[PDB]
Design a protein around this ligand. Structure first.
Ligand SMILES: [Cu+]
Lengths: 394, 301, 50, 100, 42, 51, 50
């Protein structure tokens, strides 16, 4: 892991890291290679799905192979899905197992056997030729694609002969490649599948949606007796949480309307309360967009309690407006004088909203992981409050 | 016309384009064709068979078009089938056989020579004479690890087959794109008839998928977004019409107005028999701007 | 008079987006896959003559 | 439009082993690159040209920078001497002056 | 722009044409949508 | 885990999973438990209670 | 120690668009226990059996 100071253009930071990643590739082993991480954070684990079979026809190794060279390719296509992890299953493996006694007898060392394998599985062609008029491309395959072929690898042979083959000192058998990650579903057990990961910052909900349509569409192609059982759907917590805040806000308008009705015995405050919020709400959503923050539970939590502290400007304005009218009920320009005194109640009110916002900065000051977790709730509010002050004046 | 008529030979269909546009057209990868489909798969054989079966469904569905399955496999080959077992009897590695296939019969450059600030290639190959024909190949002389003197035919069977002239693939794995072309009509309907008619009464092979692409994907979006713009553009236009004089009668007049102003312009398309373009629509947009102005200036008076 | 303009809008006259003109021309002909390099250089020369 | 060209030359070969050998490792490593829209490449007799398309309006140099991320993980997996080339820096418009 | 163009006007014309025809109709319309339509409006 | 009546699906993962993110040895047992709407299936039984 | 007793993959096999590993190792029987290791049979550059 390479850690950078908070708030560094990630892609930039990833770019810098690479600088010296190239100076190293040659210094480490053969085949062994260095991998740069994905592109998502630890949050990026969005959708997880198991690949099980409602029968016994399709193999464990078969499933892993299905998820690896089919599904994974199908889903990585989807927009902001960084990578589609593969989990569990088992790897179809071609196992050449030597027999020491057979080696002794024929007198061929391991080095010899290894050199043969590296020289028994390749393909090549060497230019074209002018037969007739058209040119022909000349190819060849030495391709290991049958156990017959695995067996028929010459090791030691001689003139006028016999030929010692690999079949002669080893048994070639498909097997399970030494496991590094085992996955399972319920008591039933042992099953392969894959996780979906979100390329940093991009409404996970949508990414899940795009995935789910694909899966629905794909299930047609699936072999017989295999089901994609969802193990995870971040969308649900997102939906649940979002529907939660969708309700509280309306519930807040009605509560306010009811309380108003009891205090001013009914008044268009209904539309007034509802107008003040969405606007002070709509500025918070205008600003966060610009400075591209998020929409995490915190940010949403911010606007919620803001609604609660934006009542006084509306309440205080109205009272003074209501009291100013009554003076003319006791006895254009005359609606203007009612405004004038709505102006007398303006100054300090207005300024009280502005003074409220600034005090929040100490919260920004804390700089833990938690502190940065809370920045949202405070960032949304801090910017919503100042705009709420202008809000109040409009 | 003269050129196209002057230069004519077999196998060649002439195309006449300008510099800039051509160079642009030779990098922008995709499908000019109004519509096409992609069948992704694990092996060339599978997805190819799909194109064949889809073709009939293309010609059949109400829609004039020519389905281009695979103008690709026009390649002439010479398969050198190395019989491992016969190479074995000679104590030879498939690689060593290929040594002759690649260097002796190809001419794989075996290094280059530095002349200061320049380097030319060094080529190690059998004489031109021995690489002349498949027969030549069959008789290609090989000397074994045991100074046995044999011929490529002894360890290989060479056959002439016809395969790919090139291989195109979408996202790592192989996909064949069939081009179905319908012209001058918004064919957004056809793509849906196919995606469902297929499922209901036409099958498929596990290990593959089907993708629909063409000029329409982006077009449909363009149309969609444009049609959101007209309500939004009118709403702002209305707010900008109503504010100089307030009344809706005039503002509604101007809106109900513009269409007739557009007449002369399109009747201009009439002698000229003039196409129309985003450009003609660009003029229309400007025309409608000046006329609206004229209405305003006159309404005030 | 808006009617008279409407008969047109459905007929659209003829053709769509242009291609524009540059001082020169580029020639490309679907040619078929396999050929010789010599036959290529030959055809090239003949074409440069026509 | 915005794209990154990845030319790979192979002296002589064939449409199968020019892909199987060099572009099969090239196209597949590029699927994971941050921001990649479609990774469609043309493999052919002797050459492997691989295009990476990005969404319109992406800082080209940035886009070219991202592409490179995984271009390094591949160099060792393809043949000897055979090397991967990042495109030039010009578009298809860039062909300005030609001289014989 | 209509009579000659050695430098790309397959496009300038396309947006130019509408302008003229509309400019023969536009003056006329401005003239007779102003009075008639007005008295009809009220 | 599946025994509990308040758990829906369950997923056992032991080790890593073909991804640079996960770095867990074969010891590292890592399971995802899926829960049902508290419509089901119990009276009381709060989150910490389940736990 | 690495191939016979480990199972260091000595290459993979291309099935179109997929590749599985090839593993070269002594029989499961000879890698069972430290004792097994002590008796792990080696044949020298001189066909000596140790
Ligand atoms: Cu863990």
């Amino acid at each position: 892991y390479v850690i950078f100071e908070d708030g560094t253009d990630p892609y930039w930071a990833r770019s810098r890291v690479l600088e010296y990643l190239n100076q190293v590739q040659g210094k480490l082993p053969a085949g062994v290679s260095a991998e740069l991480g994905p592109d998502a954070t630890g949050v990026g684990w969005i959708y997880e799905y198991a690949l099980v079979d409602r029968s016994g026809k399709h193999d464990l190794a078969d499933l892993r192979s299905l998820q690896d060279w089919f599904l994974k390719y199908e889903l990585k296509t989807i927009p902001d899905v960084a990578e589609v992890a593969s989990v569990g299953g088992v790897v179809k493996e071609y196992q050449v197992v030597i027999d020491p006694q057979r080696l002794a007898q024929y007198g061929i060392s391991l080095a010899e056997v290894k050199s043969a394998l590296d020289a028994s599985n390749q393909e090549a062609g060497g230019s074209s030729i002018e037969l007739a008029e058209a040119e022909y491309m000349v190819r060849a395959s030495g391709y290991l694609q049958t156990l017959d072929d695995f067996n028929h690898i010459v090791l030691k042979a001689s003139e006028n002969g016999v030929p010692v083959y690999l079949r002669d000192v080893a048994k070639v058998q498909i097997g399970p490649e030494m496991r590094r990650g085992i996955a399972e579903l319920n008591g039933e057990g042992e099953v392969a599948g894959g996780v979906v990961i979100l390329r940093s910052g991009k409404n996970a909900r949508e990414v899940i949606a795009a995935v789910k349509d694909k899966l629905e569409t794909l299930k047609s192609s699936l072999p017989e007796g295999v089901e994609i059982v969802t193990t995870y759907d971040r969308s649900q917590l997102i939906d649940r949480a979002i529907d939660n805040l969708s309700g509280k806000l309306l519930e807040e308008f009605i509560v306010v309307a009811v309380v108003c009705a009891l205090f001013l015995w009914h008044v268009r405050s209904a539309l007034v309360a509802i107008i003040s919020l969405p606007l002070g709400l709509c500025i918070a959503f205008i600003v966060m967009h610009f400075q591209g923050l998020n929409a995490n539970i915190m940010s949403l939590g911010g606007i919620a309690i803001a609604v609660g502290a934006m009542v006084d400007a509306a309440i205080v304005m109205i009272e003074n407006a209501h009291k100013r009218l009554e003076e003319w009920q006791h006895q254009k320009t005359r609606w203007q004088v009612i405004t004038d005194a709505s102006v007398e109640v303006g100054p300090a009110l207005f300024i009280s909203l502005l003074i409220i916002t600034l005090s929040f900065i100490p919260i920004f000051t804390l700089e833990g992981q938690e502190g940065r977790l809370f920045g949202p709730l405070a960032f949304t509010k801090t910017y919503a409050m100042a705009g709420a002050a202008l809000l109040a004046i409009v | 016309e003269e050129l196209d008529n002057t230069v004519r030979l077999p196998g060649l269909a002439n195309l006449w384009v300008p510099p800039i546009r051509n160079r642009i057209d030779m990098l922008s990868t995709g499908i000019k064709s109004p519509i096409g489909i992609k069948v992704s798969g694990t092996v060339l054989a599978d997805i190819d068979a799909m194109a064949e079966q889809i073709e009939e469904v293309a010609r059949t569905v109400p829609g004039v078009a020519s389905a281009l399955a695979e103008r690709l496999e026009g390649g002439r080959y010479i398969n050198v089938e190395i019989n491992r077992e016969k190479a074995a009897r000679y104590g030879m590695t498939v690689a060593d056989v290929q040594l002759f296939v690649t260097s002796a019969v190809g001419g794989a450059m075996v290094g280059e020579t530095v002349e200061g600030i320049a380097r030319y290639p060094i080529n190690l190959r059998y004489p031109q004479s021995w690489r002349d024909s498949p027969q030549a190949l069959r008789q290609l002389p090989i000397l074994t690890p045991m100074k046995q003197q044999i011929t490529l035919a002894d360890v290989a069977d060479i056959k002439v087959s016809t395969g790919p002239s090139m291989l195109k693939t979408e996202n790592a794995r192989p996909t064949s794109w069939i081009y179905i072309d319908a012209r001058d009509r918004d064919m957004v309907s056809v793509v849906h008839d196919l995606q469902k008619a297929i499922a209901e009464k036409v099958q498929l092979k596990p290990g593959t998928s089907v993708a629909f692409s063409g000029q329409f994907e982006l077009l449909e979006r363009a149309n969609h977004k444009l049609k959101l713009m007209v309500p939004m553009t009118l709403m702002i236009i209305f707010v900008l019409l109503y504010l100089a004089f307030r009344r809706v009668g005039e503002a509604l007049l101007i809106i109900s107005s513009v269409p007739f102003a557009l007449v002369g312009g399109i009747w201009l398309l009439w002698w000229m028999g003039f196409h129309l373009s985003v450009a003609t629509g660009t003029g229309f947009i400007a025309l409608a701007g000046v006329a609206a102005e004229f209405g305003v200036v006159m309404l005030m008076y | 008079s808006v009617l008279t303009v409407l008969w047109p809008l459905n007929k659209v006259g003829g053709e769509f987006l242009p291609q524009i003109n540059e001082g020169d021309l580029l020639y490309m002909p679907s040619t078929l896959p396999g050929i010789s390099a010599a036959e290529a250089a030959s055809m090239l020369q003949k074409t440069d003559k026509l | 439009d915005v794209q990154v060209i990845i030319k790979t030359s192979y002296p002589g070969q064939a449409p199968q082993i020019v892909e199987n050998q060099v572009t099969y490792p090239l196209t597949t490593t590029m699927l994971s690159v941050p921001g990649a829209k479609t990774v469609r490449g043309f493999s052919q007799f002797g050459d492997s040209y691989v295009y990476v398309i990005f969404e319109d309006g992406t800082d080209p140099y940035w886009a070219r920078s991202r592409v490179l991320e995984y271009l390094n993980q591949v160099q060792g997996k393809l043949p000897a001497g055979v090397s991967a080339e990042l495109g030039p820096d010009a578009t298809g418009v860039g062909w300005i002056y030609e001289y014989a | 722009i209509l009579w000659g163009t050695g430098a790309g006007s397959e496009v300038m014309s396309r947006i130019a044409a509408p302008m003229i025809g509309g400019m023969i109709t536009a003056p006329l319309l401005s003239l007779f949508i102003i009075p008639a339509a007005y008295k009809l409006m009220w | 885990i599946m025994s509990v009546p308040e758990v829906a699906r369950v997923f056992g993962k032991t080790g890593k999973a073909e991804t640079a993110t996960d770095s867990a040895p074969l010891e590292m047992v890592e399971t995802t438990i899926q829960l049902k709407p508290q419509e089901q299936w119990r009276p009381g039984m709060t989150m910490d209670k389940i736990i």
